[PDB]
Design a protein around this nucleic acid. Structure first.
Ligand SMILES: [K+]
Ligand SMILES: [Mg+2]
Ligand SMILES: [Mg+2]
Ligand SMILES: [Mg+2]
Ligand SMILES: [Mg+2]
Ligand SMILES: [Mg+2]
Ligand SMILES: [Mg+2]
Ligand SMILES: [Mg+2]
Ligand SMILES: [Mg+2]
Ligand SMILES: [Mg+2]
Ligand code: NA
Ligand code: NA
Length: 86
RNA sequence: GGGCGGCCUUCGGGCUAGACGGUGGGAGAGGCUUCGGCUGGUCCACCCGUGACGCUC
């Protein structure tokens, strides 16, 4: 579920400015937020499988944004890859 | 890794129409579950955010 007291919390942390809600960093961060939130899920339910489909999609997406931000803005890449760790 | 890709530009650099994110909706014979749930995807809107971040073996 996450909720604002989570999803907004991350954004307010990775935002590049007061109102940022879709800046690659934020996009990656909260992307890494539900990636875990679901990694944990799959454990309790090792028979789900179907949900793993998205675990993979989300993971790929997260790496594609990161590669994008690695070309256009190296500095910010190391920054972001921290506070989360790649 | 490969192949093919938006607009403008005096090529320095602009920009949003794509994609993604935020918000708010919608439908579903998704899946798993000790039945208390936990969760994947999918389609809409806006005229909010990033700014081609894409599509394809
Ligand atoms: K499915
Ligand atoms: Mg696809
Ligand atoms: Mg440019
Ligand atoms: Mg999506
Ligand atoms: Mg709803
Ligand atoms: Mg049900
Ligand atoms: Mg759901
Ligand atoms: Mg917009
Ligand atoms: Mg730029
Ligand atoms: Mg291009
Ligand atoms: Na094309
Ligand atoms: Na223009």
């Amino acid at each position: 579920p996450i909720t604002k007291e989570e999803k907004q919390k991350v954004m307010q942390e990775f935002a590049r400015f007061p109102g940022d809600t879709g800046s690659t960093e934020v996009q990656v961060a909260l992307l890494t937020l539900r990636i875990n939130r679901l990694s944990e899920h799959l454990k309790v339910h090792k028979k789900d499988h179907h949900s793993h489909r998205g675990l993979l999609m989300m993971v790929g997406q997260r790496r594609r944004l990161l590669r994008y931000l690695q070309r256009e803005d190296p500095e910010r890449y190391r920054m972001l890859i921290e506070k989360l760790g790649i």
